[PDB]
Design a protein around this ligand. Structure first.
Ligand code: FES
Length: 106
């Protein structure tokens, strides 16, 4: 599938992603440097932060208890649609997923 990423400035990048890649993995492996991801996809930092598009949130499995507490330690304050991009797993149904990246991760 394919994920759309949007920078603070509003510009877009379409990145390939296989089924099963996290959104972070997909980002890092196709040139999206802004996603710092200190812990390397290991669900223990708040630095792979993203905002899921208002319309795509519903299609994702819910945030768990761990991701939820991680999210209130973000560098840019959490929004309703905030997610940890290493905790988003890509599936056919997310082909087209839109993610916007915060002003900062650290
Ligand atoms: S990269 Fe550390 S939680 Fe996603």
């Amino acid at each position: 599938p394919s994920i759309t990423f949007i920078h603070p400035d509003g510009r877009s990048e379409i990145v390939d992603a296989a089924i099963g890649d996290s959104a972070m993995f997909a980002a890092l492996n196709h040139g999206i440097d802004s996603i710092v991801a200190e812990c390397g996809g290991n669900a223990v930092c708040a630095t792979c932060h993203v905002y899921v598009d208002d319309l795509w949130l519903a299609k994702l499995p819910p945030v768990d208890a761990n991701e939820d507490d991680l999210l209130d330690g973000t560098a840019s304050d959490r929004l309703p649609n905030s997610r940890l991009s290493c905790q988003i797993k890509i599936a056919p149904e997310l082909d087209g997923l839109v993610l916007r990246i915060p002003e900062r991760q650290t």
